[PDB]
């Protein structure tokens, strides 16, 4: 869909629809964390495939705390019952223990351990053929394209003896090795393998192409860090087609129509007022809803994300002239 | 080469002074300035320091609440809501004919810095701990904010009697 | 906080006076709005201040009401008590904005600038990577590197 519409609001609902019906539900609350994260480590178990421990270790934690109900009763089909358990670590007999096995460890032992878990955690999710499984990842477009983690300069694999005779430009000039395609990420491989490998009508993908990219209009010098709306935003600048760059079926989600936008912003300000996060006692200085609705529709295009930012900007609307006129009308009646 | 053992007129010039005034014209000796930061006066230092709230903080913050909402760690909130209830009560209407003192005229020139220095010093003395024009504390009846932390909705099961 | 170099403080009124220039900078009060909004804290003083500026900005162009001779002076007195109120309203909000933010950085673990106090995490003034030997006000020789007040992990 368009950038900043109800892109992920559909997803968060889709999981709430799933985990209510109790079906096992995987959920990547931020696919940015994997493909655009703090660091990327080669998987020790798996050759040529990389791992991101910052999100993986968390993903193991959450998949435990989220589906801990089912995953307990969810027995492990195919995985060695001899994974190295620390002093006082029970053997995993249900997958729920296997995810406990990884994230519950003192780093840096976790990093080598989570690489194995993320390799075998999917081995159970794939082997299953009856238990309905739903896979959701907010930001699938980041999984199909490259990742800003770039392959290390090969001299990091040569154990350089010295510098002058090193014949080595890692110290002098930073040169750009190609980006790591997210399909090389072992966990994304876990997903991507299930996409191509057929005969798996058990696993389902309800995914969302996120578009939070740094807006580039053709020229952009330095941002003004005193107020920069997109510092935490992602930086892609890449045009994405879900058609040619994915297998899932496009479900184009669009900006609200004036119908749904109405019931939203009615909720957005009135319920907000009820919880005290609104004007409250000084309501009468604020305009009414119809003006507040009509004006935001102008500035926001009914884009749900832009609505929020514009709703927060009811504060500084300088050229409202309803209440100042209406109060003057009331004093006439009085 | 062979640096002469005694230098004829290199050191035999006039002595050079080292600047000894920490500021303009090399005259301002060290003394407690107006810019001194009284950390004791209130939860913020007085005077306050230049504080920028960039959009990187907010978006990082918005992720932070994604933790204490689900992790249930509502305590870190419970410092805030009390920190706000005390420091946000309606500032009382000042009585007729009262105003903050302005720099008395004719004491100095208009251009002399003694104008702003006095205003800063007056605004030092009126630290928020001394802000009596605004009410706060236990005795102030709080009509807007709920009184007890359990009245905040995260304890909705206990609110249910 | 990406700004950490030494700073210069200005009294509340001397900043409040700038009005829509920096004090009531439209997007700034939108920043501290969301921050207040998201924290579950009611934005009562901000919207209390917001109407103060919005009326002043809207009416900064006109003349003052005609000063007809009033021996009572009640109008001149009312012209003052209503003013010092407005200043006192922004005084509270100006301090309020600095109250939460420094405390907010206590929750995001962002080291504020020099000579800055976070209520619990940095009781006295924090100073790291300054241009001088000692803590500028407490005359304590700095430790190298810049001392840290939060716990290392995220």
């Amino acid at each position: 869909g368009p950038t900043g519409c109800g892109k992920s609001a559909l997803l968060c609902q889709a999981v709430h629809y799933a985990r209510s019906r109790d079906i096992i539900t995987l959920y990547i609350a931020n696919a940015k964390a994997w493909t655009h994260g703090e660091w990327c480590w080669p998987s020790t178990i798996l050759p040529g495939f990389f791992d991101a421990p910052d999100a993986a270790r968390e993903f193991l934690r959450t998949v435990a705390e989220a589906n801990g109900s089912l995953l307990q009763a969810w027995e492990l089909r195919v995985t060695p019952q001899d994974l190295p358990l620390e002093q006082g670590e029970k053997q995993p007999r249900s997958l729920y223990d296997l995810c406990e096995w990884g994230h519950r460890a003192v780093a840096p032992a976790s990093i080598d351990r989570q690489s194995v878990c993320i390799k075998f955690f999917f081995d159970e999710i794939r082997a299953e053929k009856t238990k309905p499984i739903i896979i959701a990842v907010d930001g699938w477009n980041l999984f199909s394209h490259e990742t800003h983690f770039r392959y290390p300069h090969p001299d990091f694999l040569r154990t350089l003896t010295t510098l002058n005779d090193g014949l080595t430009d890692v110290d002098l000039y930073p040169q750009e090795l190609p980006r790591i395609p997210a399909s090389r990420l072992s966990f994304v491989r876990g997903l991507n393998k299930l996409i191509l490998s057929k005969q798996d009508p058990n696993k389902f993908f309800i995914t969302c192409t996120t578009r939070d990219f740094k807006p580039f209009d053709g020229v952009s010098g330095f941002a003004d860090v005193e107020n920069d709306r997109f510092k935490n935003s992602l930086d892609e600048y890449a045009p994405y087609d879900p058609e040619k760059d994915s297998f899932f079926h496009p479900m184009q989600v669009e900006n609200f129509t004036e119908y749904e936008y109405r019931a939203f912003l009615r909720f957005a300000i009135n319920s907000g007022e009820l919880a005290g996060l609104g004007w409250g006692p000084m309501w009468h200085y604020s305009s009414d809803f119809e003006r507040k609705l009509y004006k935001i529709d102008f500035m926001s295009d009914r884009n749900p994300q832009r609505v929020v930012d514009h709703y927060h900007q009811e504060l500084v609307w300088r050229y409202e002239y309803k209440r100042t006129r209406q109060k003057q009308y009331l004093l006439a009646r009085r | 080469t062979a640096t002469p053992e005694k230098f004829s007129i290199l050191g035999t010039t006039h002595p050079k002074p080292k600047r000894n005034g920490m500021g303009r014209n090399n005259k301002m000796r060290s003394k407690p300035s107006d810019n001194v930061a009284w950390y004791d006066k209130g939860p913020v230092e007085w005077l306050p320091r230049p504080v920028r709230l960039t959009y990187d903080q907010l978006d990082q913050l918005r992720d932070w609440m994604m933790r204490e909402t689900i992790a249930g760690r509502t305590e870190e909130f419970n410092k805030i809501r009390h920190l706000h209830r005390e420091w946000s009560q309606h500032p009382l209407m000042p009585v007729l004919g009262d105003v903050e003192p302005k720099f008395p005229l004719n004491l100095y020139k208009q251009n002399h810095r003694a104008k702003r220095r006095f205003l800063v010093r007056w605004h030092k003395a009126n630290s928020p701990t001394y802000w009596m024009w605004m009410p706060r504390g236990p005795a102030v009846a709080t009509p807007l904010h709920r009184s007890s932390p359990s009245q905040f909705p995260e304890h909705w099961k206990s609110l249910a009697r | 906080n990406t700004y950490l170099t030494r700073s210069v403080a200005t009294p509340p009124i001397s900043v409040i006076r700038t009005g829509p220039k920096w004090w009531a900078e439209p997007e700034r009060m939108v920043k501290h709005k969301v921050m207040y909004f998201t924290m579950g804290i009611d934005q009562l003083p901000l919207r209390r201040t917001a109407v103060i500026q919005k009326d002043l900005k809207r009416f900064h162009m006109c003349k003052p009401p005609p000063r007809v001779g009033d021996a009572t002076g009640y109008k001149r007195s009312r012209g003052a008590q209503l003013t010092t109120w407005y200043r006192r309203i922004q005084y509270q909000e100006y301090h309020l904005q600095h109250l939460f933010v420094r405390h907010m950085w206590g929750l995001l673990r962002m080291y504020p600038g020099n000579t800055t106090k976070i209520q619990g995490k940095a009781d006295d003034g924090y100073v790291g990577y300054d241009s001088v030997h000692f803590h500028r006000y407490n005359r304590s020789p700095l430790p190298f590197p810049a001392r840290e007040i939060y716990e290392r992990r995220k």
Binding site: - | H90, L92, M93, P94, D98, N126, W131, M132 | -
Partner: peptide
């Protein structure tokens, strides 16, 4: 012109401590 009209009670005369320096 008076904006933000409100009816909270009055304050106490001299609610602020005087300055650090004066005549």
């Amino acid at each position: 012109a008076p904006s933000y009209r409100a009816d909270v009670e009055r304050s106490i005369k001299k609610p602020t401590v005087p300055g650090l320096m004066s005549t």
